[PDB]
Swiss-Prot record, chain A:
Ranges where the Sushi domain occurs: 4-68
Function: High-affinity receptor for interleukin-15. Can signal both in cis and trans where IL15R from one subset of cells presents IL15 to neighboring IL2RG-expressing cells. In neutrophils, binds and activates kinase SYK in response to IL15 stimulation. In neutrophils, required for IL15-induced phagocytosis in a SYK-dependent manner. Expression of different isoforms may alter or interfere with signal transduction.
Protein's UniProt name: Interleukin-15 receptor subunit alpha
Localisation: Membrane; Nucleus membrane; Cell surface
Record organism: Homo sapiens (Human)
Curated annotation (Swiss-Prot), chain B:
Gene: IL15
Protein's organism: Homo sapiens
Name used for this protein in its record: Interleukin-15
Keyword Glycoprotein recorded: yes
Domain of life: Eukaryota
Disulfide bond entries: 40-85, 47-88
Length: 81, 114
């Protein structure tokens, strides 16, 4: 019942995000970093939602996993670490 | 009762999901194999099934979820190999219309009953 807005989103490994809106119910999307791809079956959507008990709002944790681009795992072989 | 491939019922669920999403604004791009090779149709089906779960998660809708759940159980009832196939993340990302059209295309390959 105020002008409730969400804090910065938490980091997602190998992903970045540019928030268009911090307002309640805002839907945003992480994007996998160059050479990484959204893992099939995982979602990059995050939503600003209301802890309706305490009146604070947070970004939902996306199911997103960014994995190395299989095009490059195969065609541009590389060490780990 | 007569015997009819389970995949016929999968198409019926895809039609239902397409109708249900029409109201909503689901704007994920999803990995889409629009030209499945028969030698890789299990790999390709598996990708479609995975990405279908994204439509459900992003919808946050009971009926879409129920219909996705019903589809995936049918499909897994119809499955359980292949080599030289693309991984899902090598596939083009397409919008929900194109994704679902291609899903129908491959479900139709599996009615044969391939």
């Amino acid at each position: 019942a105020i002008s409730i807005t969400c804090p910065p989103p938490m980091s997602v490994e190998h992903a970045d995000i540019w928030v268009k809106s911090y307002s309640l119910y805002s839907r945003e999307r992480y994007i996998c970093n160059s050479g990484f791809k959204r893992k099939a079956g995982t979602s990059s959507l995050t939503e600003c939602v209301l802890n309706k008990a305490t009146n604070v709002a947070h970004w939902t944790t996306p199911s997103l996993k960014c994995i190395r681009d299989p095009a490059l795992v195969h065609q541009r072989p590389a060490p780990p670490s | 009762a007569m015997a009819i491939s389970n995949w016929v019922n999968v198409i019926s669920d895809l039609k239902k999901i397409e109708d249900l999403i029409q109201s909503m604004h689901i704007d994920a791009t999803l990995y889409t194999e629009s030209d499945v090779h028969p030698s890789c149709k299990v790999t390709a089906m598996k990708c479609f099934l995975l990405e279908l779960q994204v439509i459900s998660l992003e919808s946050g809708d009971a009926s879409i979820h129920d219909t996705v759940e019903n589809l995936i159980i049918l499909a897994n009832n119809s499955l359980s190999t292949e080599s030289g196939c693309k991984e899902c993340e090598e596939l083009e990302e397409k919008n929900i219309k194109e994704f679902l059209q291609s899903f129908v295309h491959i479900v139709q390959m599996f009615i044969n009953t391939s």
